[PDB]
Design an enzyme around this catalytic site. Structure first.
Site, mmCIF file in Angstrom:
data_model
loop_
_atom_site.group_PDB
_atom_site.id
_atom_site.type_symbol
_atom_site.label_atom_id
_atom_site.label_comp_id
_atom_site.label_asym_id
_atom_site.label_seq_id
_atom_site.Cartn_x
_atom_site.Cartn_y
_atom_site.Cartn_z
ATOM 1 N N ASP A 76 47.567 35.263 44.426
ATOM 2 C CA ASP A 76 47.969 36.437 43.628
ATOM 3 C C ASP A 76 48.772 37.417 44.488
ATOM 4 O O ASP A 76 48.457 37.615 45.651
ATOM 5 C CB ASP A 76 46.730 37.143 43.052
ATOM 6 C CG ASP A 76 47.063 38.076 41.875
ATOM 7 O OD1 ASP A 76 48.244 38.195 41.495
ATOM 8 O OD2 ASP A 76 46.115 38.665 41.305
ATOM 9 N N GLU B 148 45.614 37.832 32.482
ATOM 10 C CA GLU B 148 44.947 38.474 33.618
ATOM 11 C C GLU B 148 45.037 39.996 33.504
ATOM 12 O O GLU B 148 44.045 40.708 33.772
ATOM 13 C CB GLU B 148 45.587 38.046 34.936
ATOM 14 C CG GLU B 148 44.822 38.498 36.170
ATOM 15 C CD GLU B 148 45.215 39.887 36.635
ATOM 16 O OE1 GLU B 148 46.339 40.354 36.324
ATOM 17 O OE2 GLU B 148 44.376 40.526 37.310
#
Ligand SMILES: [Mn+2]
Length: 326
Positions: A211, A156
């Site tokens: 997240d 990511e």
């Protein structure tokens, strides 16, 4: 246009059960999180160890576990990446997808643990699978065309300054791979009547991406009109948990208010982007503002807020229970 699946309100009995957190629950979640509270930069041995831990944990729960591994160019040269995709019932047409990233930022200033980013979300996905295993294995046998899928994205984080070419390596790769993998309703178990399935990406019913969780008092908002019906269930679940007195607060008679009953105008780049571009409905469970510790060396274990994590775990368990009718 309404949500394609009718969303049956969780019975009060099930709300109460999903909102209980035993002392052994806390112990189990914390033992899980321990495995993630290590530097895990792409290329590293600890990264490999974290990957194997996720795989083993879910294979141990009899899930189908697949790895989407590839080498990709980065500003630091060629790097190995491996997304981990765990599916409770592979043949079920539709997936409620829960997701996070398991790599940690390569921080030039020193060793970076990334406790909120995203060791907590990683542990939360595994904890959900473990705590709900009995009910999930039962749900799997129904033949109702819906299942749970967990995606732990690799890469990511940017290696250098964030860019479209330097970020989201694993999610960009997986979205592309699943979009190109053609399939159809007749190949799948119990698709909804009005479904349009031409490839694997179409089977993602909604992706809930966790997240930067674990810091005290996060503020969430609905980022996407398309998933407002799903988002509203989180708002409603949180409210009922508070009504039931099941949230951990510093004082009596306070309520958590994590899921704001509003939308906000904000663009956050994260692992949902490549899927959003292919019409996957997204619920983005990320705080705004970001935790104060974001991308600092203080994003560590002691700056996590355990009561908030417990409260979020209650909401997430209730949400999965409600969505899958556990
Ligand atoms: Mn980050």
């Amino acid at each position: 246009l309404k949500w394609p699946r009718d969303l049956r309100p969780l019975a009060h009995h099930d709300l109460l059960y999903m909102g209980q957190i035993s002392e052994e629950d806390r112990g189990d979640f914390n033992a899980t999180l321990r495995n993630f509270l290590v530097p895990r930069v792409v290329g590293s041995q600890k990264h490999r160890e974290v990957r194997e831990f996720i795989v083993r944990s879910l294979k141990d729960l009899d899930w189908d576990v697949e790895e989407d591994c590839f080498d990709g160019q980065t500003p630091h040269g060629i790097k190995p990446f491996c997304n981990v995709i765990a599916t409770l019932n592979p043949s079920a047409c539709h997936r409620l997808v829960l997701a996070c990233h398991y790599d940690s930022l390569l921080h030039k200033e020193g060793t970076f643990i990334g406790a909120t980013d995203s060791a907590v979300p990683c542990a939360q996905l595994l904890y959900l699978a473990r705590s709900l295993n009995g009910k999930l294995q039962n749900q799997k046998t129904r033949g109702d065309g819906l299942t749970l899928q967990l995606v732990f994205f690799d890469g990511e984080e940017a290696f250098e300054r964030w860019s479209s070419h330097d970020s989201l390596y694993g999610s960009r790769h997986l979205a592309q791979k699943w979009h190109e993998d053609r399939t159809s309703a007749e190949r799948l178990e119990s698709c909804l009547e009005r479904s349009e399935i031409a490839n694997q990406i179409d089977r993602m019913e909604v992706m809930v991406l966790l997240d930067l969780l674990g810091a005290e008092n996060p503020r969430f908002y609905s980022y996407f009109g398309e998933t407002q019906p799903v988002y509203r269930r989180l708002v409603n679940i949180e409210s009922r948990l508070n009504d039931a007195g099941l949230m951990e607060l510093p004082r009596r008679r306070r309520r958590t208010n994590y899921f704001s009953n509003s939308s906000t105008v904000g663009f956050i780049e994260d692992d949902h982007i490549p899927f959003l571009k292919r019409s996957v409905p997204i619920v983005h469970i990320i705080p705004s503002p970001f935790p104060d510790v974001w991308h600092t060396l203080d994003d560590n274990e002691q700056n996590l807020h355990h009561p908030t994590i417990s409260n979020l775990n209650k909401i997430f368990k209730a949400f999965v229970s409600e969505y899958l009718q556990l």
